[PDB]
Structures are given as C-alpha cells and as structure tokens.
Amino acid sequence: MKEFYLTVEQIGDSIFERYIDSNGRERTREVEYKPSLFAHCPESQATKYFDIYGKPCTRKLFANMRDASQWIKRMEDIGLEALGMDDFKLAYLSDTYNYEIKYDHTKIRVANFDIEVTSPDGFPEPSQAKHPIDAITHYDSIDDRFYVFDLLNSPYGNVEEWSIEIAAKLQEQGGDEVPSEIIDKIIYMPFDNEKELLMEYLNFWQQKTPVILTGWNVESFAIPYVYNRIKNIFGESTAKRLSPHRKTRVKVIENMYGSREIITLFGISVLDYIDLYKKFSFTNQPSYSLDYISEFELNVGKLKYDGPISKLRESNHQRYISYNIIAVYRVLQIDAKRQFINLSLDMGYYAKIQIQSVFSPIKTWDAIIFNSLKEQNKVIPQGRSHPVQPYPGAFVKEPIPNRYKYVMSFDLTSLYPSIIRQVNISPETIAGTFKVAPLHDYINAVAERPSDVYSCSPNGMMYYKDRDGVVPTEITKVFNQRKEHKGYMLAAQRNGEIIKEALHNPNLSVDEPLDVDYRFDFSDEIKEKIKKLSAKSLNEMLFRAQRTEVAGMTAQINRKLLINGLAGALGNVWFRYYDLRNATAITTFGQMALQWIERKVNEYLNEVCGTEGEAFVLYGDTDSIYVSADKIIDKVGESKFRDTNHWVDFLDKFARERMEPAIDRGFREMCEYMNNKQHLMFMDREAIAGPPLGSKGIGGFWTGKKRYALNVWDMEGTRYAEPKLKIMGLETQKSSTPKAVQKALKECIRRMLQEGEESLQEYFKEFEKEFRQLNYISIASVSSANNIAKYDVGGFPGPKCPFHIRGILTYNRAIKGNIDAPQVVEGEKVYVLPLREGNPFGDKCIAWPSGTEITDLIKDDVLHWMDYTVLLEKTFIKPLEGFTSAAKLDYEKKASLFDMFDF
DNA sequence: TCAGGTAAGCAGTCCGCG
DNA sequence: GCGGACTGCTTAC
Ligand SMILES: Cc1cn([C@H]2C[C@H](O)[C@@H](COP(=O)(O)OP(=O)(O)OP(=O)(O)O)O2)c(=O)[nH]c1=O
Ligand SMILES: [Ca+2]
Ligand SMILES: [Ca+2]
Ligand SMILES: [Ca+2]
Ligand SMILES: [Ca+2]
Ligand SMILES: [Ca+2]
Ligand SMILES: [Ca+2]
16 A cells, blocks of 8 residues: 555654554654745756746755745845745645555544533633543544543542443433443443543553544543643643644634634644534534534434533432443544545545645645646745735625516536636636726627637636646546535435335335445336335435435535635635635626526527516526526416426426527627636526415515525426425524524425415414414524623623623623523523513523523523513514515405405 | 635614604 | 614525
C-alpha cells in the first residue's frame, strides 16, 4: 500500500507528522522541512516556475520555516509579492504525498468519548475545572471497545461498582437497557481515587492515541475539562500528554458577540460531532442536545431519570455510568447513519489538508487549487488584505399570490458551478471587460453582443477560451463525484417507493429481507420477489433503502456544498483568489439565465397554446422556474383521464419531449450570445404538482417570494406512492414554530391542496377546540438568544428589547439566587411562551433552555398562567390567515343564505 | 454561534399617522 | 390598526 498521513503539525522549525507507513503501521516523525517560496524575476531565463498569469518566478529555498515566514514580512515591508504556499504543512503534504491518496479507514484511530462531572453549585466550567471527573467512556474504533473509567470515591459521594449484569436488563427488570450488541464490547475499570483514574486514562491515551477525536460537545466541554482538570491536579506538562507531541495551545474562538477558549491538541484532529452535525446535516433544530438529536435521528426515546443530574451519581450510580456509555454509543449510531466522519476523511484526503479543515471550504479550496497548480509547476499568489464589500446575488421573481392548480417546476443542474464552467471563470482566465448594457437588454436579447473573441458574463467580464481555468478544472472534478453519489441517492429513493407500494399488499409468510444493493434500480427479478415478501421483511428493506438514501444524500449534498462554496469563496476577502469581478460574474450571469429562460418558456408556451403575452411562468428563484400547466391539462380535458397517475404521466411526457427541447434550444442561443466556452445550462423538469383527480384540492399556492406549497406526485423521476407535500418557506418549515403548530399547519395545508375548502374548515374547528390540551413544550416557540447582556438593565428589559430576550430576563428573576436551576446559555436556543396578564412573573412572556423541561421551581406557575389564546393567534391563526387569503379561501365557514332552516 | 455567498420573509419595538 | 425604520432571527436558493 501507499503511505498516507494521519496528522500534520508545525512546531518551530519542524513538521511533526503521524502517518501510516507502507507496512500498514502507525508512525511518527520529525522533519526539519525546508520550504520554498517564489519571487517574480525578468524572463532570464532560468526558469521553470511561472505564476498563474504566466510571469516567470525564481524559487527561493529557505534554511527553515521561520526564515521563510520572516522573508514574507520583509517582502511586505518592501512592498513586493511573496508568492507560494505560505501554510507550510500544506506544502509538506503536497511534496510528501504527490499522488491521489488512498486511505484505509480501518487503520485510522477514531475515538469518541464522553465524560461525567458532578456539580452541586451549577455548571462545571472547563476553565476552572474545580470538580472531580467521576466517569469517562472512551470508544476506540480500532479495538471496537468501550473503555469505562469509573470513579468510586468522591467528595460528592462514595459509590458501589457498576454492574454490567444490571445494565443489560430491561428498564422493566429494573436495569438500564444497555443495547445487547455492545455489552460484550465493554471494558470496565473502577477506580478508588480520581488521581489513579486520570493516570491510567493518560497511559491508556498514550497506547491508543486518537487520530480523529469526536463526541458531543467534546471541543467545548470534554476536552477543555479533561485538560484543565489534569492541569490543576498534576500540572501543565502532564495535561500536555493529551497531545502526542506534548504541545497544546489555548485557542480563542471569536464570533460576533464574545469569545470562548478551546484547547488545541497538536497532532490530533478534533471533529466535534455537534459541529459536524450543524455543518453537514442540513436541518435546523430547536435543540442541539444529544438526547434531542438522538430522538430525531434514531427514534430512540429520552433516557429517563428522577432528580437532577447533580444528584444522580449519589442516588443511582448504576444508571449514571450506564447513561454515560449510551451517550457515546448514540453518537456512533448517528454516524453509522449520517456518515459525516467518512465524508470528512474523503474530503480531507482529497484536498490534502488537516482533516479538521473540512469545516472550511476556503481552506479546502486553497489546497485543491494549490496541488493542482503545483503539478503544472505553477506558483500561487500571495494572500492580500481586502475590505468587505456587499455584492449582488440571485434573482427572485415576485409571484402573484394565488392558488395554482397544475404546476411543473424546472431546475438547472448545479447552477453556480455550471456557470463557472460555461464561462470559464478563474483568476487567470480574465481577458478584460466590455461596455455593459442594462441587464434587461441582455435578457430580451437586444443588446450588442458582448464579444466575438472571449466568453462573457453580463456583469462586464470577458474570459479566455483556449484553455480551462484551474477553478473550472478542479470544480468539474468534484462535480463529477457529486453526480455519482446523487445517482445512488435517487436510485435508493425510487427503490424506497417500490417497497412502499408492495406494503399495500404484504404476503403472509415467514421470510427474510433480500440481500440487495439499494444504490442501483431494482431489477425486474428483485421487483417480483418483493411482491412476495412479508410486511416485516418489506419494512426491514425500506429501512435499509432509507439508510442507503441518507448515505448518498450526505455524500452528494455536501459535495454540492463544497462546490457552491467556491462560488462564494470568491466573494470572501480571506480567500487567496478573492475577486469581486469573478463572484459577481457568477451571480449576474445566473440572474440573466433565469430571466432569459422565463422569456423563452413564455414564448414557447404562448405559441403552442395560440395566445399572446400570458404569463406561464408564475415564479422563479435563483435557478428554477414554476410553470402554470392549467391550460395544457385543460386542452386534453380533465374528464379524459383514467386516474391521477395518468395526467402525471402526460405532463412528464410533455416536459421531457416538448419542453426541455425548447428550453435546451433557448439556452444554446444564450451560450452563443455570451460567446461562452461550453454550453452547460441543463434545465430538467423537477416537480409535477396538482390535486388528486376528482378532488376539491387546490394543488398549490404562493403567498410571496420564498413562500409556497405544492402537492407533488413526481420529483426528478421519483413517482411517489403517496403524494408528497413540498412546502417551502412557510411556518411548517421554521424551527421557531411550535411542534404542535407545525403538524397542524401542515395538516391544514394537506387539506387545502388535497381536499378543499370544506375539509380545511372541518380541521380548523377541531384543532381550535382541543389545542388547550397540548403539552406546553409542543406549543412553545423557539428562538436563538443573543445579546441578553445588551438588553439586561438591572434584571429588567432594556429599550428595544426583543420578545425572546424579555422571556429570558423574566426567567432569570424567577430563578435568582439558585445555583441549581438550569441557566440559559448565551447563543443557544430557548423555548418561549406568552403569559396572561396578572401573572406572578410580572411580564408578558417567559423563556428557558430549549430541549429541556422548565425547572420544577416554577413549572406549575408557568403552566397555570400560560396564555393559550395569544399562542393560538400568533403561531397558528395568523399564519393560516396568510395561507387562506393567498389561496382565495376561508378557514371559517362564512354565512350564506342556504342555511336558515327552519325559518 | 470558527469554518463560502446573497435574497428576502416574518415577529416584534417604537412611533408616527391629524 | 397599520406601516416604515429598525433589530433579530430564519429560510430559500
Ligand atoms: C442550496 C444552495 C444553493 N446555493 C446557490 C448555488 C446554487 O448553484 C444555486 C442553485 O441552488 P439549488 O437549485 O438548490 O442547487 P444547485 O443548482 O446548486 O445544484 P442541484 O440543483 O443540481 O442540486 O443556488 C447556495 O449558494 N447555497 C446553498 O446552500
Ligand atoms: Ca452527561
Ligand atoms: Ca439547481
Ligand atoms: Ca437539482
Ligand atoms: Ca404481495
Ligand atoms: Ca433550485
Ligand atoms: Ca434535459
């Protein structure tokens, strides 16, 4: 096997590297790496190094890394460009791994741990670390073992040994329901004192030093706590053994509001799973507690316990230890599903970066482009300082607020990256500028053709056409990877729908799930065998189909994130290739393409229906168009269809055979208009929407930009066994809206689109009548809480105080002088509820940490003074009024004349 | 909420709107 | 009441 790196660090004048050697063994080496940088020179000619612009460069080989860094400072003092990779470990990896890296994950030590620390006086601050660490579970992926370190004797209590036998038993037997599949994988180590616990942990850490270190909030809690605790007890040198190079750094993380401190452990890549989840999951949650995310991702219920956590070890150490083990497991289960570690490794090695750099598309692209250019002997430019300037983005059409019965959407494949490729936008393909006409002139094809020589964007920029730029070239590579995984995702989706179909008629027989690859469309053979399976086996298969879909989704959606991130990286001052000319060239081009093809679709459809000037495109956002299809359906007549699937077939055929060709023709013309290098505007049908045939459903509606709902039957080639509501923007999609309210609004929408005005009024009446039985948490609003301090004036709301902040301030007064009550954390999310006037809290609302029950100190009093009426109007009625009005219907039955009986 | 980008919606505060 | 200016927060793309 080829070697691969595990980690890389710069310490003084040494590169420190952990790696896997050609034998498959983990290794560590110190390399006094001498870096090279470059300077412009006259042709000469030496001379094999050229900058991206083609200007000749002399390589300057440095004695050590500090000389190289100091030289960069001198070149700035003098006012001259210091060229080349100034992040010296990237140059190191580039020289040391001059090939496409093939990693073997089973050789990489992925660790995930969680710790427990008991605290009577509130939250155990990692900076202080003044309380004993009384438990650590550390799973090791190489050993496949959960290592449990359990403190028996504490100032906060002396406990008995944990029982694995009691832990395995059901909650109903009195045990802790530790999953049977991990029981045998537990290595349990009890300790008589915390010193002996920490000493073994460090010895253990040394024998099995993590490469990849993860967990839930491990970066913000477990790592800083463990390091500081050890620091307080043994001294800093001992704490520093958490790093295989014995180097650590207190690092300050800045944001908009304040600053926290984390501990950088050199020679380890920390990928905090909460952070992977937030970057890669593409879900906005009301809470990021492990409990909450586990429920959502895995459908496993909350770990129940009586009393507060700060009394749990003392009252139930058995359960304490067991919940610490389950915590670690639940993260592994989430990763088994979402595969974010795999993803991170994939991308990290592809880019040749430190794995933890995957969180930064800027750092990822810097490296991909650097390695690409080094291969051609090209030298990268120096990073400059730029002032942050706003620039324009996409076009969003203003829709006429209305019901819309029949809709087909069309969408451009990977828009921004395709534009980069079509136009050939790169730092070194800039050819010049042309005199620009107002955008509408280019849209309506009446402006002077920008150029006869170069590939153009309507923002004024012209690009070379002889060769592909390094941005287009490299972005094409990641795009192709993305297209493979998306293939798998869509295939697993289709497969999922065939299984769902077969569930309508499950055979009565004891059998097993078929060994199949859900990444590929089911053969006719597999299809028939499925029609013969039991409900149990079909369900087990659906689950696997849905897991294959989620793995494909992660691999595809995040590659899409990386490629789109390049488009935006160009508009980021910290990026080596920041150029607002290039970022605006991408966005302006997109504005044109959309509005150009709106004009084209209108013309085609107006011609084919024999009308003049009617809008067929009702809406569009960034890269998609929504086309009214009422007139196409009405031409062949609604009564001419067998069932819903029949008109869905018909429109599918209309869109694939008549529409897309016309759209392709239109986009080809725009390519030759802008004189682009390559036609890559591919706009395929996405969704086909409408009511169930024979129903009073309205099909879909829009209330404004980014706010609409559609009843979808087919999406990207997936024919739904059950119609799917595609709701964009509306309150059902916002994390700030209550759960109960999301469900209810959704049902109201379902009824409007699938059933009609009457069915809608049935539900609203019933909801309104029962809503006061709903659990207080399921009707709380959620909100992130920033700048509580800013609006805090002596316990009371300052001027302009936000509603949710007032709720927090109210919560603070009610719990004042109590260290044990859960504190609201600045920057996290809170649940919010309105309070009836006259309450003992003395204000109109209260807030408390989301994902939690409100403390028993005030719960009863909160539940009593809860303003239901206000909740109903704000979160539910108002939004519903907005839907019903846009769609031209009523949620309350209005008074007619056909009713007054007997009169 | 350390970690590509812009567009644009809605809740709420404050206050004008004779 | 409702909107406009403004802050704060969230989603669509
Ligand atoms: C979803 C999304 C889109 N965009 C921009 C860039 C996209 O090219 C453009 C269109 O978005 P999308 O239509 O959502 O996706 P896409 O065209 O990039 O890729 P595909 O349709 O094949 O899945 O909007 C972002 O900048 N960030 C995002 O998170
Ligand atoms: Ca815990
Ligand atoms: Ca698209
Ligand atoms: Ca798409
Ligand atoms: Ca059957
Ligand atoms: Ca789209
Ligand atoms: Ca097509």
